[PDB]
Amino acid sequence: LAAGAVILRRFAFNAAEQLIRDINDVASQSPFRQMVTPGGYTMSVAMTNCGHLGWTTHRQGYLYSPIDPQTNKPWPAMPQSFHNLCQRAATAAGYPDFQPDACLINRYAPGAKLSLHQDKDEPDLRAPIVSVSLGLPAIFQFGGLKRNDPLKRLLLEHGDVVVWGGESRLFYHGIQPLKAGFHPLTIDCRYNLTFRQAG
Ligand SMILES: O=C(O)CCC(=O)C(=O)O
Ligand SMILES: [Co+2]
């Protein structure tokens, strides 16, 4: 893809149904909820987290917390399937020492999007981002360091894993409004798992 970035198409295919079963298990303790941005806007993407640290929104800005702001209980632990798939994808991408402590689980309903942003809430930029696509296909935008920087448009389908780090660690990215459709394992949505070293 780019410098320090690669797309491992259909990498998570074999682990997919186990990952989805574990998403439901995580969601049973920490439900999927549409977070409100520090500006006051409800996001179209429904989110939840697992592992030690979880990505959330607050009035001060975006941050990581070991506590779920909705349940007021800690986020569920990182499932074995998640940890194993992430490790294998990381090593295959050229980052063998990747040790995630956070997994952001994103649910995209038809028409849901995630506008162009940078993953800049993590202090250690040496650690990559491992992103797993499950279910309905979506067009992933991948740009550069600036907002006006040219965007590459890639389709991400069920089982595709994108890993970006190194030079591409702070590159702008996002998902375009999800096209309506169906998938045998996720029914009417697209699930995405983003593994990060947050601490
Ligand atoms: O859904 C995707 O493929 C990207 C998710 C993402 O960019 C994020 O969670 O920060
Ligand atoms: Co992101």
Side-chain angles (χ1 to χ4, degrees):
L1 177 61
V6 275
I7 305 167
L8 313 173
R9 288 173 183 93
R10 309 301 190 276
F11 196 87
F13 192 79
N14 289 169
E17 69 170 88
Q18 182 55 49
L19 290 175
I20 291 155
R21 276 190 292 262
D22 289 331
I23 282 173
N24 294 325
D25 186 64
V26 169
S28 70
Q29 184 179 314
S30 275
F32 270 109
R33 85 296 306 258
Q34 292 173 249
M35 298 180 184
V36 183
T37 66
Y41 296 80
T42 306
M43 293 169 78
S44 63
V45 180
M47 293 170 166
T48 190
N49 297 268
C50 63
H52 203 279
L53 287 160
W55 190 86
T56 193
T57 56
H58 196 241
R59 295 174 181 170
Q60 294 184 269
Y62 306 129
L63 57 97
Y64 282 99
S65 175
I67 299 293
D68 180 334
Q70 184 171 294
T71 67
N72 299 107
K73 285 162 63 179
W75 299 106
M78 182 79 86
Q80 193 188 91
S81 68
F82 279 42
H83 196 267
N84 285 345
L85 195 271
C86 180
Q87 199 183 269
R88 289 181 67 242
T91 308
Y95 304 93
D97 293 51
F98 184 46
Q99 292 291 130
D101 56 8
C103 184
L104 176 62
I105 312 178
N106 301 311
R107 181 182 68 191
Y108 294 77
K113 57 150 188 171
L114 195 64
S115 300
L116 220 72
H117 67 285
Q118 283 181 117
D119 276 18
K120 52 187 279 181
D121 302 303
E122 308 71 50
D124 192 356
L125 302 177
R126 204 165 59 232
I129 303 293
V130 174
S131 191
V132 187
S133 288
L134 298 167
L136 269 62
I139 290 140
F140 179 67
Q141 302 182 136
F142 204 65
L145 296 170
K146 289 187 175 183
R147 317 193 76 99
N148 294 68
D149 240 86
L151 301 170
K152 289 186 169 191
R153 281 176 176 81
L154 314 310
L155 187 74
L156 292 190
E157 299 183 86
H158 179 250
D160 295 352
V161 181
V162 190
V163 183
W164 66 99
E167 192 163 340
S168 55
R169 183 57 184 77
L170 287 179
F171 280 13
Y172 270 96
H173 57 284
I175 293 285
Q176 293 188 4
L178 191 78
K179 190 184 174 186
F182 172 76
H183 189 284
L185 286 311
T186 65
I187 306 302
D188 64 305
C189 72
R190 173 186 180 252
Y191 288 118
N192 175 259
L193 312 174
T194 49
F195 299 91
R196 306 119 183 291
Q197 184 203 109

